[PDB]
């Protein structure tokens, strides 16, 4: 379980006003969004499990996004990106908390695995680090990530339990394609599953076959679930695709 908030200001010459777009995610699914180019300069719900919040929630949230627009690059087609969030396990306890920045999608200043120090990946960003660690931004962020980010994530998980903990099992297939007379590719599919985290591993005769196996990264479907496949090239020969998902009592073994 993870809730992330993204804030980006795509700079514009001539237009004068940088495009500030803000999004919030829970388990990779969007639930809030703000856009300076939108018709109404207010943040909206993009999930049905948060429209239930009262009007004080939105106006409380909308005013905070406006402040972040002014201070997006306070201490930093130029694109400035911001991210923060927290990760949570099935215990519903804190795992890992992030607070990161990028300058044109190159890492600029990122909060370490321990929520205490910053990793300046750009030499221009080391004054930013010297400023923040003198301002103790880490301690103030540690309170929010360990305290506030998790608590509302728990509430969001309760509010959208029909959505976030859906734990759909993968609708799995095995597809075989003859690429040549002497070899073929065996593709094992993972369709309509949730969460996106899945492991598809190939084995020959019961031992791993990583060196000759290709795959594709998990694909968001239009439904709200995800897709993935991994393929191995066989010289014809029986190989097994192991599917490991949260929605399965036992990992599956597939054969052609």
């Amino acid at each position: 379980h993870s809730m992330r908030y993204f804030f980006t200001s795509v700079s514009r010459p001539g237009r004068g006003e940088p495009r500030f777009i803000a999004v919030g995610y829970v388990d990779d699914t969007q639930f809030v969004r703000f856009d300076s180019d939108a018709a109404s300069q207010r943040m909206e719900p993009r999930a049905p499990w948060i429209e239930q919040e009262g009007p004080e929630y939105w106006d409380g949230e909308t005013r905070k996004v406006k402040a972040h627009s002014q201070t997006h690059r306070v201490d930093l087609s130029h694109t400035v990106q911001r991210m923060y969030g927290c990760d949570v396990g099935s215990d519903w306890r804190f795992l890992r908390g992030y607070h990161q920045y990028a300058y044109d999608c190159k890492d600029y200043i990122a909060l370490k695995e321990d929520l205490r120090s910053w990793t300046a990946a750009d030499m221009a960003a080391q004054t930013t680090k010297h400023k923040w660690e003198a301002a103790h931004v880490a301690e103030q962020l540690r309170a929010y990530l360990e305290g506030t980010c998790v608590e509302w994530l728990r509430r969001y998980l309760e509010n959208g339990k029909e959505t976030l903990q859906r734990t759909d099992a993968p609708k799995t297939h095995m597809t075989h394609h003859a690429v040549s007379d002497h070899e073929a590719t065996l593709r094992c599919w993972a369709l309509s599953f949730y969460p996106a985290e899945i492991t598809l591993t190939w084995q020959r005769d019961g031992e791993d076959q990583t060196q000759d196996t290709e795959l594709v990264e998990t694909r968001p479907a239009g439904d709200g679930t995800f897709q993935k496949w991994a393929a191995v090239v066989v010289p014809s020969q029986r190989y097994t695709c192991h599917v490991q998902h949260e929605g399965l009592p036992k990992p599956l073994t597939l054969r052609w």
């Binding site: 908030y5 409380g60 949230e61 905070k64 996004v65 402040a67 972040h68 201070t71 306070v74 923060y84 103030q140 962020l141 929010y144 506030t148 509302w152």
Partner: peptide
């Protein structure tokens, strides 16, 4: 919720 403070 958004971070809130500056």
């Amino acid at each position: 919720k958004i971070l809130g403070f500056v």
